[PDB]
Ligand binder design. Structure first.
Ligand code: CLA
Ligand code: CLA
Ligand code: CLA
Ligand code: CLA
Ligand code: CLA
Ligand SMILES: CCCCCCCCCCCCCCCC(=O)OC[C@H](CO[C@@H]1O[C@H](CS(=O)(=O)O)[C@@H](O)[C@H](O)[C@H]1O)OC(=O)CCCCCCCCCCCCCCC
Ligand SMILES: CC(=O)O[C@H]1CC(C)(C)C(=C=C/C(C)=C/C=C/C(C)=C/C=C/C=C(C)/C=C/C=C(C)/C=C/[C@@]23O[C@]2(C)C[C@@H](O)CC3(C)C)[C@](C)(O)C1
Ligand code: KC2
Ligand SMILES: CC1=C(C#C/C(C)=C/C=C/C(C)=C/C=C/C=C(C)/C=C/C=C(C)/C=C/[C@@]23O[C@]2(C)C[C@@H](O)CC3(C)C)C(C)(C)C[C@H](O)C1
Ligand SMILES: CC1=C(C#C/C(C)=C/C=C/C(C)=C/C=C/C=C(C)/C=C/C=C(C)/C=C/[C@@]23O[C@]2(C)C[C@@H](O)CC3(C)C)C(C)(C)C[C@H](O)C1
Ligand SMILES: CC1=C(C#C/C(C)=C/C=C/C(C)=C/C=C/C=C(C)/C=C/C=C(C)/C=C/[C@@]23O[C@]2(C)C[C@@H](O)CC3(C)C)C(C)(C)C[C@H](O)C1
Lengths: 143, 192, 173, 76
């Protein structure tokens, strides 16, 4: 009689959040391997955050403060209220972030939702493969 | 009304109320308005005394013990008179007469008397069980000391209270400026 | 939104991209509010580029680091020199003045928080400003505000470009 | 439920909570990791009084957010 396990609304919200985060994270790993930004410590993708935390000086401290503040503000502003029960007013993952209004029609919205979910799942799997391959050298061929 | 009808919120120009509460502290904490008025008047009184106390020592100095009364300026006067106790307000027990130089000075005496007066006047008026109305907006800052002097007319009494409040506020600001300027330049009266 | 404030002799409606063609009143209101805020901040930034060139404050910007106002150079170079703590506290002051003491009195007209002409209701604490009674005066003042905001928005970008081109904000001179 | 803060608006409560959180987190991190004071105190110096007073603001910031939410949820 206590709602210990989340509603499918919360599950879809978390799935979309993970898909977006991992879609950013995979390209971030590749682009951190390739490029770099002056003023930030040199480290692999699996230690960059720890290095930034350990050596805040110059611009890295301010930058990581900015990133953390932005993330926390966004999470607070778009907390999935009552989605744990399924009584969430807005659609799961619908933060309203559509600056360019690429998708507006219902059919286009559904097709784009499916495409986003597929790509987010692929990115989640790729990021998990990266992490597991690095932390168990022989687990994944590419890494 | 504004700030529970307390005096002092009226502009110099007739017909306009200055009502200076930028932070809206009166509305935010109305139940503490009598306490705020008491604190304002107390600060004004201590400040009106303290400004003249910054000015006069330059003209005259009483010949007390030279450990403090030989202080160069008002900035160092507090440090000289407070002594060098092992703890800020701790009397030396082994060396009561200050032969080791670690004894509180005359500022401790005046502080103790100020504490007695405070506990017997302000805390007495505010917290005493036998004084149930206690500290209210009407009597805030009123200890009946010299009340026989103020003019009988209620309008003139209000004007005199307003004069007290304005002079106390001006003295607060003036003492702040005077002591800060004294610290910065360490000069005589013009920068106190 | 052609009749709204911001149309004058040099150009008319001037919406080449037609971003306001959809005629969404809420979107136009947000756009105008952001325009006014950007213009005001740009005017502040232009003056803050202009004044340090001649006058620099006395004292220590960061006494802990022995950083004097004369040590740090004005311009984009100041972002690194001024401590992140100082930048965060500037952000904190701006957030205070955005959330607490700047409140939209009327949603119909954006960018107006009741601070009066030349935003003089925030000159000093403890004063309340009044809107200009004359409709012509209101219109002229608001149009001047918007035009100067646009000019400062362009000028601050120009000064950033000059600071990039030459280490000092006025290297050419 | 907010006691004396019931007269504070949701906007100013939010600003106060955010500011207190920032200052307290800065003080805590500076005191603990990025500007440790244990070595200085052992040498004999006094603490950085700013960090101790600042660090108390973090729990104050937390409770100020719950108060901001309560006030906002109440239409103030
Ligand atoms: C309008 C908002 C805004 C503003 C004014 C700034 C301004 C700044 N950011 Mg940025 N930043 C923003 C949003 C913003 N940021 C957001 C939303 C994020 C997270 C997505 C970041 C994440 C970020 C990082 C990680 C860094 C900056 C840095 C900077 C500085 C780089 C110089 C420059 O911008 O030219 C500058 C103070 C750099 C810095 O601190 O330089 C001193 C830096 O390292 N920002
Ligand atoms: C047990 C601790 C706890 C509790 C009871 C709350 C309670 C609350 N937080 Mg949250 N919050 C917490 C920890 C906690 N927070 C932490 C550690 C952070 C990181 C600094 C935040 C950051 C945060 C933000 C940025 C916001 C809230 C907000 C809120 C309110 C609405 C719910 C929400 O959006 O949560 C979602 C966010 C969470 C972190 C949920 C934590 C759930 C815990 C672990 C159980 C509510 C009063 C919102 C609000 O109305 O603020 C005025 C809001 O915008 N919180
Ligand atoms: C032992 C001496 C003593 C005592 C018992 C008191 C007692 C009092 N003073 Mg204080 N006061 C003293 C010396 C003393 N004073 C001296 C020497 C001066 C300068 C001449 C003042 C100047 C002064 C002013 C200007 C005011 C008070 C106020 C008060 C009252 C509130 C105290 C308070 O909120 O504390 C809490 C104060 C703290 C700093 C925190 C406690 C210490 C922490 C835990 C360390 C109380 C009746 C206030 C009052 O009456 O308001 C209506 C007030 O406005 N006093
Ligand atoms: C009504 C009060 C008052 C008056 C008449 C003055 C007058 C003056 N102040 Mg100011 N000052 C005041 C309050 C006042 N101050 C306050 C409340 C503070 C903060 C505590 C200061 C802090 C201050 C500083 C730091 C300096 C002045 C200085 C000055 C002089 C040039 C301005 C002038 C004589 C300047 C000066 O010439 O100092 C010698 C100067 O450097 N003042
Ligand atoms: C970056 C801030 C900013 C913002 C948010 C806006 C917003 C706006 N401008 Mg623009 N404008 C800006 C900077 C900005 N302006 C600058 C820097 C200039 C100078 C080159 C102009 C010059 C300008 C003109 C000449 C006009 C607008 C107008 C408009 C409106 C049309 C919006 C649109 O179609 O897209 C809207 C209120 C129009 C207006 O007033 O619509 C009512 C209009 O006539 N703007
Ligand atoms: C060793 C050092 C010793 C120092 C001791 C210092 C003692 C302090 C004296 C002030 C306390 C007075 C008091 O509690 O009376 C209660 C009255 C309430 O009025 C009261 O209100 C009462 C009714 S009611 O409470 O409002 O319902 C009423 O009966 C009463 O007459 C009226 O005065 O006190 C106040 O008005 C509130 C003042 C609170 C000040 C606290 C500052 C603490 C620091 C904050 C940072
Ligand atoms: C219809 C629809 O919905 O779509 C849109 C609509 C709308 C309203 C437009 C939106 C928006 C907002 C937008 C698009 C906002 C864009 C903002 C931009 C592009 C800002 C650029 C700043 C560049 C700077 C500071 C460069 C600074 C460069 C500097 C300082 C360079 C400096 C130097 O180069 C110099 C000059 C010389 C070099 O040698 C050295 C260096 C230092 C590099 C929406 C809502 O989002 C969606
Ligand atoms: C942040 C800094 C800032 C700057 C640098 C700045 C510069 C200029 C210039 C310079 C060229 C002009 C000419 C100008 C003119 C007017 N400003 Mg303005 N202003 C700033 C801030 C505010 C705020 C907060 C408000 C405000 C306003 C008005 C009104 C309206 C008066 C009325 O209502 O009768 C007029 C005529 C109020 C308003 O309603 O604006 C829609 C209002 O709330 N301003 N302002
Ligand atoms: C792990 C691994 C491998 C792998 C792999 C795989 C399958 C990787 C897959 C990666 C994948 C599938 C990556 C998607 C990224 C999507 C991004 C970045 C989108 C950003 C989009 C952004 C930031 C924004 C979009 C907007 O639309 C928004 C939201 C609103 C609009 O108004 C505005 C715009 C248009 C801006 C190898 C190489 C096969 C072997 C080796 O072992 C290592
Ligand atoms: C209200 C108003 C306005 C206003 C205002 C403003 C800006 C007001 C500002 C007020 C301000 C800033 C007031 C500072 C006071 C500082 C004091 C009291 C410091 C005392 C310090 C003292 C007593 C220190 C003493 C010692 O350190 C000494 C010297 C030596 C040491 O050995 C010993 C000790 C420690 C004991 C506007 C803006 C004009 C609008 C409207 O028009 C009206
Ligand atoms: C009479 C009366 C009223 C009144 C009044 C009046 C006359 C009010 C006057 C207020 C006044 C006059 C307020 C000054 C503030 C000055 C400040 C904050 C200075 C800071 C200065 C600083 C921070 C300086 C720092 C430095 O020195 C440092 C530390 C190092 C040096 O290298 C140099 C520098 C500069 C860097 C009311 C309210 C109107 C009505 C009421 O009824 C009663």
């Amino acid at each position: 009689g206590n709602m210990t396990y989340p509603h499918v609304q919360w599950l879809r919200e978390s799935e979309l959040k993970h898909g977006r985060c991992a879609m950013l994270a995979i390209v971030g790993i590749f682009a951190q391997q390739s490029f770099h930004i002056d003023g930030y410590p040199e480290a692999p993708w699996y230690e960059a955050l720890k290095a930034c935390y350990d050596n805040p000086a110059g611009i890295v401290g301010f930058g990581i403060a900015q990133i953390s503040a932005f993330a926390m503000v966004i999470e607070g502003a778009y907390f999935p209220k009552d989605s744990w029960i399924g009584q969430m007013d807005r659609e799961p993952g619908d933060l309203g972030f559509d600056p360019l209004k690429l998708a507006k029609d219902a059919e286009s919205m559904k097709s784009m939702q499916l495409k986003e979910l597929k790509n987010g799942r692929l990115a989640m799997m790729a990021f998990m493969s990266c992490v597991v391959g690095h932390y168990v050298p022989g687990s994944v061929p590419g890494v | 009304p504004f700030a529970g009808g307390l005096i002092g919120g009226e502009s110099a120009f007739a017909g306009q109320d200055f009502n200076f509460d930028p932070l809206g502290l009166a509305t935010k904490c109305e139940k503490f308005l009598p306490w705020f008025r008491e604190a304002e008047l107390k600060h004004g009184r201590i400040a009106m005394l303290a400004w003249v106390g910054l000015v006069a020592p330059e003209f005259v100095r009483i010949p007390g013990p030279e450990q403090c009364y030989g202080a160069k300026t008002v900035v160092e006067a507090h440090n000289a008179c407070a002594g060098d106790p092992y703890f800020p307000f701790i009397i030396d027990a082994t060396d009561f007469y200050g032969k080791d130089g670690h004894q509180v000075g005359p500022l401790f005496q005046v502080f103790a008397f100020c504490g007695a007066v405070e506990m017997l006047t302000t805390f007495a008026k505010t917290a005493n069980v036998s004084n149930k109305p206690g500290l209210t907006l009407a009597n805030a800052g009123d200890y009946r000391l010299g009340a026989n002097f103020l003019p009988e007319d209620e309008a003139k009494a209000k004007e005199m209270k307003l004069k007290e409040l304005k002079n106390g506020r001006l003295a607060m600001l003036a003492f702040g400026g005077a002591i800060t300027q004294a610290t910065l330049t360490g000069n005589g009266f013009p920068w106190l | 939104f052609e009749g709204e404030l911001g149309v004058q002799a040099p150009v008319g409606y001037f919406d080449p991209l037609g971003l306001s063609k959809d005629g969404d009143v809420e979107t136009f209101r947000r756009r105008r509010e952001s325009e006014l805020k950007n213009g005001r901040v740009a005017m502040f930034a232009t003056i803050g580029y202009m004044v340090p060139e001649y006058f620099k404050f006395p004292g220590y910007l960061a006494p802990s680091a022995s950083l004097k106002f004369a040590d740090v150079p004005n311009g984009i170079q100041a972002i690194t020199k001024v401590p992140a703590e100082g930048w965060l506290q500037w952000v904190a002051l701006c957030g205070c003045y955005e959330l607490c003491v700047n409140q939209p009195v009327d949603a119909a007209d954006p960018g107006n928080y009741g601070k009066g002409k030349l935003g003089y209701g925030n000159m000093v604490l403890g004063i309340t400003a009044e809107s200009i009674s004359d409709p012509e005066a209101r219109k002229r003042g608001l149009n001047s505000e918007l035009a100067n905001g646009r000019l400062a928005m362009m000028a601050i970008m120009g000064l950033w470009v000059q600071d990039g081109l030459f280490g000092t904000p006025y290297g050419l001179y | 439920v907010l006691g004396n803060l019931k007269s504070f608006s949701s906007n100013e409560l939010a600003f106060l909570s955010m500011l207190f959180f920032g200052v307290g987190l800065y003080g805590n991190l500076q005191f603990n990791y990025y500007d440790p004071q244990w070595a200085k105190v052992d040498a004999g110096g006094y603490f950085n009084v700013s960090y101790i007073v600042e660090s108390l603001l973090l729990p104050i910031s937390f409770f100020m957010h719950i108060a901001c939410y309560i006030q906002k949820q109440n239409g103030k």
